[PDB]
Design a protein around this ligand. Structure first.
Ligand SMILES: NC(=O)c1ccc[n+]([C@@H]2O[C@H](COP(=O)(O)O)[C@@H](O)[C@H]2O)c1
Ligand SMILES: NC(=O)c1ccc[n+]([C@@H]2O[C@H](COP(=O)(O)O)[C@@H](O)[C@H]2O)c1
Lengths: 463, 463
């Protein structure tokens, strides 16, 4: 890696574009005006990319050469980068205040801030804008996931009375769908903030590496099948496939895709008769998770259930919604996203079916399929000091006011009525709204505040 | 990194699910039916993740311990894995046929195949499905990028009479827009397949490191200002800012955001009257690239041009389209995506403006905002050998014919009309359609064939 080469290119030319004699550049991160976002991710980036000794003569030299050719001109600041290398052993002379990872903060608030601690490195603050801004993803993935947890909570509760298993109603199947490996870990790490059902192994390590979890299972999964493990047996041997798999995993819960060919056939005939005896015989602690993976995600669930219900002793829970015997359950692993999820869980309700019967599998819509656009994650400069003169900076582009910038130094506060207030123009000092909720998390190449994954979860909790 | 825990957690349970006596499992990848796609990035994944000794006592132990916690039951195939570690010193006993990188193939075609080379390692083929399917990304990026190149070409041509600079018309900005570092490298490296304008330094390393480029660095960049490097001079000293950066970069070409406050002001007043003398003086090989970033990229470009046209000597080129004087150009660095691009470039055309005046910059629209769903990049098992005989496998969900997978041993061939044909059920063995264009690129953990980035580039060339 090399932080010297992990920023937008033009930012390498930024140093001489500042007002002459600007000892300080102070920028923040907010979710301009999905109301409340979960602030997660920053900690990962800090440890893996910004803290410690990030500058080395070798990394400088490389930058020089790459930049001297990228721009075809040594517009690269080796001088300024040599300074950090010597004065601070390659440690970034910057301080970063941020809200506790996992914090649910309503749109429009200063989640974190970054400023240089050395007048020399005033140009450092924004350089790492890019690296830091990449945090919109972990935030967006943790936020959208949580928003899906709410919908699940809403209906699981109105249909079962409790919220048991709520942390397992959305399984992450986005490893295969994310843009890179790193993304899978990062993204999956963000889903685990709100649920414990994940297949993206990548998420777990990243957590036991940058957040830590005392908890036993930082993420859970159970044996499941994929189309190869069924289709390979040949079309005429789907039953053989199913029966081989329910047997291989009879003592533990096992999910089994049945849409390889006609979902409505595996369900009604292959599980409805040909293999009935392999289902009714299973324990609730190791049921068969029928899994459709094609067709209208809602029409398919109602049919799957209609078929299953007409093949297995469906009871009626307290609130009056149909429920399949404890040993049989469904998992929609295709076409599930925030929008879709809501339609299904609603369609299940309208059709008097319990959200207990189903669990969901979202993949490329959970991890991949999110743009910084969503939560309007933006990193911007609001305070600068030139000639000992502090200035309240900001952008207020005529043509898009909903793209204004905060001015002055910023502070996060709890209003007297509970919510949050981001004070501007350093008005945080006029101690009125209590203390700044932003804790210093990074200072001169050292992490000054981490949060176990268990803490983050607690913070991201619902209700 | 660890290949043992780099797949979808449930695949760790697939071995027990394949029909007993399965000695082989042939799996392919295609973009099921953006008619033609650029096949790119598989080489990087092979090298960065699958090449060589990927299995070790440690990796195996780690997996077991993790999968032990993840599954609460030792479902992890430690034996299957250790065997690879001994017999093949940790290299993967798999072969991978694949179309040369950069190749442009229409939908429905097999771009690559993966099969186990050792009867014991039948379970490896789809184990690496996840990690390999991630190639959908660089492909999508590469494709969508090349599809935007065509649009620029289409119009630059019928507006300027040529394509000079058609390769520096889409500049990648999505570095802060991607979900992670590794992603910016991968994706930006995809864009560089079709353009040389990148600010996301990431893609450069990836290219030099994994593909190699003889030319001096794949893509390039030019010094440009950002919102902080202008708003820092205070709202009133916007002129000072412009003038400081244009003089700082009078030498080479410089881009400067002008929407910080009224885009239409900086243009008409600040650039067209105050600093008007700093523009006209500039070199045509180092002009001032005015850069809006406000709202509705179309309406803004026309006004920017309309303002700039009325402030500078607009010349009608040999095609009838207006053209600014060599020292003045514009760029849309906001709201540009493959769809938006079209409207703008055509909105320009209708309004008799030349696509010579404006180059573009796509951010998260270019690197993020891409899903496997776009080109339907899918990795499915088509052939299996159970008990010595081969079997043609495939899935065909009833509720969705657009998912039917290919069956049997596939081979990629040139039709007699130049186009392509993915032949199924080993039919490619009838010689009838020339040779199989899919080249073995991976054999028993070793890169059997690579392509330089200059090759990928040629192959992906347009027209
Ligand atoms: N049943 C499982 O455990 C499991 C795990 C990972 C991926 N998958 C499948 O992979 C696919 C991923 O596609 P999407 O990312 O578009 O959701 C889905 O069809 C999904 O069902 C299933
Ligand atoms: N002018 C430049 O060289 C440059 C480079 C990278 C990003 N940017 C800006 O950063 C933003 C990135 O956001 P989007 O990826 O959503 O487009 C854009 O508004 C873009 O103009 C500009």
């Amino acid at each position: 890696f090399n932080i010297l080469l992990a920023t937008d290119s033009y930012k390498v030319t930024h140093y001489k574009q500042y007002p002459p004699n600007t000892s300080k550049v102070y920028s923040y991160f907010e979710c301009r005006e999905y109301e409340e976002t979960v602030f997660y991710g920053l900690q990962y980036i800090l440890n893996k990319y910004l803290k410690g000794k990030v500058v080395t003569k070798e990394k400088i030299q490389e930058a020089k050469e790459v930049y001297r050719e990228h721009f075809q001109d040594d517009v690269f600041n080796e001088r300024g980068w040599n300074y950090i290398l010597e004065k601070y052993d390659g440690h970034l002379p910057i301080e970063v205040k941020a809200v506790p990872e996992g914090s649910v903060i309503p749109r429009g608030n200063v989640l974190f801030t970054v400023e240089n601690t050395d007048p020399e490195c005033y140009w450092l603050t924004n350089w790492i804008e890019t690296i830091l801004v990449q945090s919109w993803y972990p935030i967006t993935v943790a936020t959208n996931s949580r928003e899906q947890k709410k919908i699940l909570a809403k209906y699981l509760l109105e249909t079962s009375g409790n919220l048991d298993g709520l942390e397992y109603k959305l399984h992450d199947f986005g490893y295969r769908g994310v843009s890179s490996q790193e993304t899978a870990g990062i993204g999956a790490s963000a889903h685990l903030v709100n649920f414990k059902g994940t297949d993206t192994v990548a998420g777990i390590a990243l957590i036991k590496k940058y957040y830590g979890t005392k908890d036993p299972v930082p993420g859970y999964s159970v044996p499941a099948a994929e189309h190869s493990t069924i289709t390979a047996w040949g079309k005429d041997h789907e039953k053989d496939a199913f029966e081989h798999i329910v047997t291989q995993f009879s003592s533990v819960p096992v999910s089994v895709v049945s849409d390889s060919y006609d979902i409505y056939n595996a369900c009604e005939k292959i599980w409805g008769e040909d293999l009935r005896h392999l289902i009714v015989s299973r324990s609730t602690e190791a049921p068969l998770i029928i899994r459709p993976d094609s067709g209208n995600p809602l029409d398919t669930v109602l049919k799957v259930l209609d078929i299953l219900g007409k093949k297995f002793p469906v009871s009626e829970n307290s609130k009056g919604y149909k429920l399949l015997p404890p040993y049989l359950r469904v998992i929609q692993g295709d076409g599930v996203d925030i929008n879709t999820l809501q339609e299904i869980v609603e369609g299940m309700k309208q059709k008097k079916w319990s959200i207990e019967n189903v669990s969901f599998g979202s993949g490329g819509a959970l991890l991949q399929k999110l743009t910084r656009d969503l939560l309007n994650c933006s990193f911007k400069c609001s305070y600068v000091v030139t000639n000992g003169l502090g200035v309240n900076v900001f952008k207020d582009p005529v043509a898009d006011p909903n793209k204004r910038s905060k001015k002055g130094r910023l502070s996060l506060h709890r209003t007297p009525a509970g919510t949050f207030v981001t004070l501007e123009e350093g008005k945080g000092d006029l101690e009125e709204y209590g203390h700044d909720l932003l804790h210093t998390v990074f200072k001169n190449g050292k992490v000054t505040k981490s949060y176990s994954f268990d803490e983050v979860r607690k913070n991201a909790q619902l209700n």
